[PDB]
Amino acid sequence: EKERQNRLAEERARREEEENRRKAEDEARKK
């Protein structure tokens, strides 16, 4: 269970950092 939950949690965090760098490069284009 913990293996599964941690895997899903890192998948979530990776998607989150994807969106963060994405908004970052968007703002960069606005610059």
From Swiss-Prot:
Q: Which residues form a coiled coil?
A: none
Q: What's the superkingdom here?
A: Eukaryota
Instruction: Quote the tissue specificity entry.
Output: Heart. The fetal heart shows a greater expression in the atrium than in the ventricle, while the adult heart shows a greater expression in the ventricle than in the atrium. Isoform 6 predominates in normal adult heart. Isoforms 1, 7 and 8 are expressed in fetal heart. Isoform 7 is also expressed in failing adult heart.
**Signal peptide range:** none
Q: Which family does it belong to?
A: Belongs to the troponin T family.
Q: Which disease is it linked to?
A: Cardiomyopathy, familial hypertrophic, 2: A hereditary heart disorder characterized by ventricular hypertrophy, which is usually asymmetric and often involves the interventricular septum. The symptoms include dyspnea, syncope, collapse, palpitations, and chest pain. They can be readily provoked by exercise. The disorder has inter- and intrafamilial variability ranging from benign to malignant forms with high risk of cardiac failure and sudden cardiac death.
Described function: Troponin T is the tropomyosin-binding subunit of troponin, the thin filament regulatory complex which confers calcium-sensitivity to striated muscle actomyosin ATPase activity.
Name assigned to this protein: Troponin T, cardiac muscle
